[PDB]
């Protein structure tokens, strides 16, 4: 038996309830905080949310979220480009 669903609709920031679904994720793989197609789709079920939101999250979230959980102090200022 197979089958599946659709969605289409714009929003902006996910709300806390769901995002600790992501988060709770993004943090034992905080390693890379880069989920699979697998993984955004699964928590798209519990967070219910477009593969594209979820994705798109984990980017600016890897900025704010990844470093805040992380902590990871590189202090790597990449060499300008001067063009």
Same mark, same amino acid.
């Not at 929003?11 to 390693?31: C, Q, T």
């Not at 905080?33 to 993984?39: I, K, Q, V």
């Not at 928590?43 to 594209?52: A, D, R």
């Given at each position: 038996?197979?089958?599946?669903?659709?969605?289409? *609709?714009? *929003?902006?920031?996910?709300? #806390?309830?769901?995002?600790?679904?992501?988060? =709770?994720?993004? %943090? *034992?793989?905080?390693? *890379?905080? %880069? !989920?699979? $197609? $697998?993984?955004? /789709?699964?928590?798209? $079920?519990?967070?219910?949310?477009? +593969? +594209? /939101?979820?994705?798109?999250?984990?980017?600016? #979230?890897?900025?704010?979220?990844? !470093? =805040?959980?992380? /902590? /990871?102090?590189?202090? =790597? !200022?990449?060499? !300008?480009?001067?063009?």
């Amino acid at each position: 038996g197979s089958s599946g669903s659709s969605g289409k *609709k714009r *929003k902006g920031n996910l709300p #806390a309830e769901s995002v600790k679904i992501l988060r =709770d994720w993004m %943090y *034992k793989h905080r390693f *890379k905080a %880069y !989920p699979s $197609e $697998e993984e955004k /789709q699964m928590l798209s $079920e519990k967070t219910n949310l477009s +593969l +594209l /939101q979820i994705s798109n999250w984990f980017i600016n #979230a890897r900025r704010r979220i990844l !470093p =805040d959980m992380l /902590q /990871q102090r590189r202090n =790597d !200022p990449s060499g !300008p480009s001067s063009g």
